[model samples]
Target chain A: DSFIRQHLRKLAPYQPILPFEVLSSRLGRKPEDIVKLDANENPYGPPPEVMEALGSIRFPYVYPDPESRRLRAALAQDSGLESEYILVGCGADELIDLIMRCVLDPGDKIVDCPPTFTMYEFDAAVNGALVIKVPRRPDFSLNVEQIIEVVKQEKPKCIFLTSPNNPDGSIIDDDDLLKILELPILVVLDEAYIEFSTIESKMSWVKKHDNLIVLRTFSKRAGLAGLRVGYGAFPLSIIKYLWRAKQPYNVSVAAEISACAALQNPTYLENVKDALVKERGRLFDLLKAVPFLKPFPSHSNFILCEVTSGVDPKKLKEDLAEMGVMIRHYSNKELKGYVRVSVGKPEHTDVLMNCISRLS
Target chain B: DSFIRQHLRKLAPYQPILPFEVLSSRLGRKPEDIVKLDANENPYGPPPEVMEALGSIRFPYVYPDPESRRLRAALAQDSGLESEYILVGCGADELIDLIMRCVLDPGDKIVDCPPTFTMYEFDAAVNGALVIKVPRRPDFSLNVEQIIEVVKQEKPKCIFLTSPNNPDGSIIDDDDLLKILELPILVVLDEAYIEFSTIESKMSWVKKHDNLIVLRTFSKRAGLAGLRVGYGAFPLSIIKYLWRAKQPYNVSVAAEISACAALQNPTYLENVKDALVKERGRLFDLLKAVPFLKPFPSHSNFILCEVTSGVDPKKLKEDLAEMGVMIRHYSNKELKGYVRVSVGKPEHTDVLMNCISRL
Candidate 1:
């Protein structure tokens, strides 16, 4: 249709992910019975306060506050970064798209490390930006030397780095990140699962570096993915334009109220984190004993394993799905042989391992 | 700051609208006590099913269904339009912006009828589209002759039309709308307040008209504004691109659930509409009685009154706010002398009139 922009016509057809309910019904199991570990969601949900607060809303008819004041103030206290430098989004997902809209002109370039969170690439296409891939090393760490080479050659506007990276729970070394920071290109460091990682967050690093944007989410941390709440810390120099460019009511009332209520119970958050970290070690050991799997040492909540023993990675995922267990699998060329399994509750682990035993 | 988009640099600074909570706190009144007639929100909120559904949500942890299948299925049943042509949004607000994103390149032109909804102009600028404003007539009807001229000469991509238009409750005549639809440009007819209007919605018209897109909202009818749910019907040729461009998880779980629950109880929605329509008549009569106001005959929920008899429209709004009665006032080039009163519950209407009488 002439109503559509030129580029979107060439856009790929829509491919819907099977939502949990659909998958649950297909498998003929209750949703409570499925061992869901695909999306790295926090199995331990936010404390009871979140639901209590959601049901008690006074005004469901009025529009949400354009500037999410209450929640930003609460995030400021939680992250120890002041609210002035922080901007909340529907999720960090919206901020990723917003930043690309504000920064990248059509046909501009962004350097993406493969086997990373794919949202960066998806959003880049939507914004009409180019992706210059700097492939990760054999161990899934940033190839800093090749990144420097691409930065100078492609003249990309910014580069996205995931700390405790998805698909493979590898953290970028501080020395490696500093080398990228030395270049003229902007850096967007995503720490979505940083709470599960051992390293301290680089969110406050934006205060010193003018070109750094550190994004964090409540999806994996507070288990509020359905609520659509995430936040980013930006340099003061760049945060002003975003305030003007963003949608007035990007964050809903329920989202803000739920995020604020989650912040009130830090003990619950801390305990969940400690439990996940403890289980990651145990899950890693159990996976290592499996004959066909080679589990990577994960610094985050999920473990990435390379399939061997003549077993196909895709078939492994499907087999597990049939048995009421779920794990992540990759479609792209770089990580075709790998499957990622997220750390769930101990019983969830026991159930998953038992299912694996039957298959093995 | 150097990295900012050049178009955004020239964009206007942010102007905040005072939210309901802020006003309630400042007015020293509880939220239930403040008779809010501003923003055209339905005071009779979503039915009991909405609250019950919200409280019963089991997975606030899972991501939302990107297609919003449940709500679209319900809307399919309600509008008699199939689910394939329908698309859900965060609000009708997001769909307006998304359509501009998909349709207009930077520096393209769009035909905007002024004294209509302000969001069209705001979104057009955000997408870098130029607005060719052909202002509405004094009666708040579209200047169809001027719209044809702009379409032929300027070659704009699309035009935005509102039914039972805001600020003035005048809807477009069928002949006038049909004339515009004959032109080459796309037509987006926003039917946000259509349930309150006596006319049948144009949602089913999309099947025959390739250029037409009709937008509807749960905000006014279902009173789910705070929960943020709205939907649009588009031709298959156009809606495919929208699905490709829209944010995958744009609709939140809370938003989808509340909207679905609201649809299940049609009796509740129908009764509320009838009550509001009845009170609109009563409100218009009372406004005509107030010697200072000239109220327009409205087909929708709100009545626009032209303030006269030496009363300043802005001051009247401020005075009403002082007495915990709130109404709408526009500070725009076209609507300065007008004050809009959203039809409220009978008790709210009484409080507002008493406050106006005292003032």
Candidate 2:
């Protein structure tokens, strides 16, 4: 007699993250005092223009432009692609779910590279599609040959590729990406953290390859994570359908104005990227000095370290949090005994180092 | 090979709505001059606190509270329902689509009452679900017996009931609603315009019936449609899944803050409601005087009139538009001969009457 669909019954229970204010109150400290880095959020936050624009927003009572005309025009100029190729969402997350909704029918399949972003798998389950996992190599490079094999056999609708991949900040090289683009299936390249990497974004490459779609976000780059803005570059032929399928008011007036303001101060965005990229270098070097930690060389803003000498990664994360230094730990088979740390301010790095140095 | 899902191909092309600012520029009139009666929007707008709060939002850069704690608490106190039963959305529109997504798998069926809100049918197609139309009767009342038969025969996942249903301002009686609720299917009651219905909302009924879910919106009531805020009360068994499934940042910071501010000014909200209700009466009487228009008695803010004699509904709409009195005209077969006008301020009523008298 239960009314819910059958698949949803098996869904993994939701795990709640303690918001900054709540966590600050629990720790008996103000939010500014907490050296937060758990979710890889941009600590510098958005530029001053964003806050100013939000304060004086003109039509807070009127509905937002459903097409997001102003923001799309800004993005077109920024990316060197036509506005016709862009579609914005609440965040890169919504676009991820939307891509699945547009492509996968029930029982459809998609290739998922594990020890990477987990949303691809979660979205697949929500969309009632099956995920065919292709584990990354030990060095965290994508298993390209295996992906082609899975595509040949399973005939999955698409494959999700995250460059400077999450958990471990290893990026896929151009040759590998080019090879994957040659496959018959659609290739969705998520570059949420591309700003931290030295390599140029492939956002413009979508013009040449019809199968490729590039997703970027304001969360990490512009410090607008709380604002919920993300955009993607799709082929002209396919973007029309996405436009038709998306919620009319998916991007709010605040989101569009905030994104536009953030883009206006490109110097601030670049400066923050420079700071995080510099901190990643120092953090990676510092982690290597710790006796029980083996650090991975990262091209992105986070460092993933292997917990050597049997020091439990979860215990390590918990112990560091007790000292007001927060980091992410993984429990999956591929990433067990590893923890990832977001590169925050220099003061945060000092606190993290002090906490690790004291650990026996 | 097509990358899009097969069912999505059948969904209709996106129809763009000219936004108020864009439309105003094209019409060569200031936005204030246009008598906006097309979308059933509240002309009074939200309270002063809403704009002030929007101006001073704490974290425009920070992501919204996925839980929507403050707004839901305010709603709980206002509605006499617990905060636990409430779920906020981008709009009531998002929740409608989300409900369909969670309950209907591909190829499942749902019952639609047409000549009502068209979004129900549009969302059905987007979800790959089939629509079993149980068209409303001549006077725009639900065909309850036909709906019951279809529910038994089609085994629909749910039935959408709109009180003070759109386009037509008819409401479902308690007896009719209770009878439909007794069926072995999920019942989604949309109270989008319930603030104008002159009856207490059935929102709390979700507590008594496991199959019932009640939805309401701030667009019409609080005049925050642009902010895109709406909410619903769901049975515990059903609400748990929606919470687990919904996007974490579905409600924006501006939406939650504006909704909270709107709630704080209940006196203002009530006065606006009273004004609209009063104006609806005056507008109804005026429309009745028109020779070619037969206006239906309305419980909601909008009036639906059937063009009588030989007058054409489409031409009447265009003629009114030429004189700056914008109203809704339907292309669907069920509503082809009808035009719906939202109740505006008294001066707007005068303008509409003058335009109708000319035609």
Candidate 3:
């Protein structure tokens, strides 16, 4: 339409992903019966305090604090970073897009290392920023060498790197990250699943580096994905601009109070993380035994498998869906015949494996 | 520093607005003691069902439905518009910005009838659109002749019209609105306070006019402001582009369920609206009796008053603040000495009247 912006008019419509209710109805099963392993959500849910706080929202009619003061104070104590360097978002997903809006003008460039979280590419398209793809190696590691080449040639403003990276669950080692940091570009390190990994979050690294922003979320750690609370550690030099550009009431009172309440119960968060990591190990071992599946060892809460010659990856996901189980399957040329399964509870794992054995 | 966008570098910083809790602490008073007649919030709050639904959010770990299918279905039933024409947002605040983002390219223009909502100007600047101001007359009525002139001369992308408009509570009659609709520009009618007014919303107008978009909110009507839920009715031609460009998870799960729950009890919503409108009348009469305040008759819940001689608008606001009463004071040149007071519960009116007598 003539009324629409030229760039947005051509942007592909966002493909809708069905939620738990719709999926349960489609499969003719209760929500509890469905083994949801698709989107890397924490099935254990948040600490009890989160629900208590949400239910007791004193001022649902009052506007939320724009600074998200209480949540930031709690995040500072939790992450060991000062509150000044932190900004809470609806999710780490919001920070990804907000960073692009702050840095990228129309026709600007950003480097994306994919077979990872595709939100970087999606947000790039929405912002009218060109995505210079630096495809990952077969092991799903950052192609740091190609990234350096792209940086030098394209002069892209920023590059998005996910640690304990999505789909493959591979962490970017210090060496690869350090090499990228040496370049002139801004680096957004998404640590959404860092809680599941053994490594410490590099949230404090923003203090030492001007061009680095470390993003973290409560979705995987505290199981507040549906509440949409995520935050980032940004250098003082860049954080000021983001504050000016951000929506004043972006963070809701529900999100802030819920996240704060979850933080209050650190033991619950730790236990949940421990359970997911232990389950990831068991899920990995079991997947390795599947003759038609080559499961990658994962540090995070999900395992990525290469569906071998005989089994069709798409049909495998569809077949699981019919049996009231859900997992992710890839269609992009780079990850063809590959499927990713998020580690769930023991019962969920048992159901998934039983369904796979039946297929065999 | 060079990584920042060129336009954003020059944009003014957003000044922080203190919330209720902060204000209560600053006043050394309990939150309940303060008569919050500042923002036009429904002090009665949503039907008990909103809180009940919020308390039982079944899956805080699951991501929200990108389509917001259930909330849109409920909003469809509530608004009498088809679910297809409605798009839910974090607030009507988000839809305003989203509309600008989809329509205005860098260096584009939008017509703003100011001394109304300032967000229109703020969002336009963020989107890199030039604002051609057609200031409202002293009565807070649209200078439609000036707007038509600006539309023809500038060929702006759209014009934002708020009915029962903010600050003054003056509404745009159908005559002024239809005349603007006759122009080539897109018409965005924000009915954020429409429920408080006597006129029917222009929401169904979108089906007839391809260029009109009507925005409504759960904030004022359902008292879910802190929950951040608002929705707009848009033409199919425009809404499709918005769906493509919007952040997939813009509305959270809490917002969706709360808005749906609020709609389930229409009797509660109607009663709350009834109380606010009734209070606005009684409050306006009392304010008219006050020596230094010239109160404007309001269609919306809030009344805008011009401070007469011997009274400073800023001092009047601060004096009320010291007494545990809060109202809005503007610093813009257009509204130099104007102050806005929101209609609260009957007790709130009593306290406000008491405070004015003391002042």
For residue A42, model 1's alpha carbon misses the true position, in angstroms, by 1.6
Over A88-121, each residue of candidate 3 has an lDDT whose tens digit, in order, gives 9999988998899888888889998888887898
DockQ of each: 0.68, 0.54, 0.73
By the lDDT metric, which is better: model 1 or model 2? 1
> Per-residue CA lDDT of candidate 3, range B1-359, in tens?
56788888888775766667777999999997889988898899989998999999988888888899999998888879999899999889989988998888889999999888989998888788899999999898999899998899989999999998998999998998999999998999999999999999989999999999999999886899899889999999888888889988868999999999999998999999999999999999999999898999889989999999888899899999999999999888888798999999999999999999999
Q: Per-candidate TM vs. native?
A: 0.97, 0.94, 0.98
How would the docking of model 3 be graded? medium
Candidate 2 lDDT over B1-359, as tens digits, reads 67998787766787767666767777778877888788888888888788788777765555678888888999999999999899999889989988999999888899998878888888888898899999999988999999999999989989898998998889999899999999998999999989997788998898999999999999896888878889999999888888777777767787888899999999999999899999999989888888787899888889999988688888888788778778999887888888899988899999888877787
Write down the lDDT that model 3 would get: 0.90
Give per-residue lDDT, candidate 2, residue B154.
84
Model 1 RMSD in Å is 1.6
Measured with C-alpha atoms, the lDDT of residue B187 in candidate 2 is: 90
Q: How well is candidate 1 docked (DockQ)?
A: 0.68
lDDT of 1 at B198: 81
**Could you tell which candidate, 1 or 2, scores higher by DockQ?**
1
Q: Which of the two, 1 or 2, has more TM-score?
A: 1
